[PDB]
């Protein structure tokens, strides 16, 4: 469900983040050569999906909701770094090589930046 | 005299005189009407003459509506001049009338005096017109 118009009655943070995400998606698009790495950052978790936007289907994904990461002791940024390592490992497992990173309306800073740097350490060409 | 407060363009092409009435073919204000059965250009002086005829016959009873406004400027070439050297200045204001257009409406007056007043008004217009009513 993606209506081109930002639905009214949304909260202020939601409206602002929706505008920022729509502006980020103007230049970012996932193909088979370079799929899009979208990081959805909420107050508790980070959910990463690598998407081929031509077919509209996610190739690999990772989160802090997985079984082997609920019990892992660390900080929000440390958990995001572990998620970045995992998503890089899964991308190498599926043969992704290079991705285009999408911050999904958030600032490239902190948890998202740690996730991206960890994915770069894993072997992702971005 | 009906002249618009202002027009966007004072020099305009001649209005099309082709086709039946686009709108205003049914009575909407009064109880009787003058319906044009022919097309043409209805100037503001003819509209005024017809209005005076109706208003003077019906005297004090009822209201008269002019459904057509002369907001189309028609230019005039400088007199005794050859052709060219631009378009002339507006001289006449017209309404573009098509067959079936209700020109004037009349109400608050019985049918015979209404018929006579609208006969008087119709004898002022340059096209053919007829008396119409709301099916009695």
């Amino acid at each position: 469900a993606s209506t081109l118009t930002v639905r009214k009655s949304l909260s202020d943070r939601a409206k602002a983040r929706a505008r920022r995400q729509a502006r980020g998606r103007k230049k970012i698009f996932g193909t088979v050569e370079r799929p899009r790495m979208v990081v959805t950052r909420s107050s508790k978790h980070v959910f990463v999906q690598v998407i081929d936007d031509v077919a509209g289907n996610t190739l690999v994904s990772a989160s802090t909701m997985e079984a082997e990461l609920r019990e892992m002791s660390g900080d929000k940024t440390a958990k995001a770094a572990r998620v970045g390592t995992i998503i890089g490992e899964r991308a190498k497992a599926a043969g992704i090589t290079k991705v285009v990173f999408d911050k999904a309306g958030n600032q490239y800073h902190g948890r998202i930046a740690a996730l991206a740097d960890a994915a770069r350490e894993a072997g992702l060409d971005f | 005299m009906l002249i618009p407060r202002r027009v966007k363009y004072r020099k305009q092409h001649h209005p099309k005189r082709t086709g039946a009435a686009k709108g205003g073919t049914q009575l909407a204000f009064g109880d009787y009407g003058i319906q044009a059965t022919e097309g043409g250009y209805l100037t503001n002086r003819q509209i005024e003459a017809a209005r005076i005829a109706m208003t003077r016959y019906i005297k004090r009873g009822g209201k008269v509506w002019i459904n057509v406004y002369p907001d189309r400027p028609m230019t005039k070439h400088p007199a005794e001049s050859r052709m060219g050297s631009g378009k002339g200045t507006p001289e006449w204001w017209i309404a573009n009338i098509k067959p079936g257009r209700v020109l004037f409406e009349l109400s608050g007056v019985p049918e015979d005096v209404a018929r006579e007043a609208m006969r008087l008004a119709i004898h002022k217009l340059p096209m053919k017109a007829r008396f119409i009513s709301r099916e009695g």
Partner: protein
Amino acid sequence: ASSSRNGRDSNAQRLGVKRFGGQLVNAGEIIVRQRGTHFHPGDGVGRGGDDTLFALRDGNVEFGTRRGRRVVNVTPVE
């Protein structure tokens, strides 16, 4: 007498669609000359400095809609 105070018109610019839907084009072929983006660049179509839309690759021209935008695509030839 008098004179005409008009009389100036610019030269014809010959804008408009040059390649219509389903037409086979080479890479770099101009699909439409236009002022502004009445058509937007789609997939395999680039936009020029004067808003000219050109083919970025070989294939067939198609006109369509992407989100809210009216776009021109060049679908690669099978």
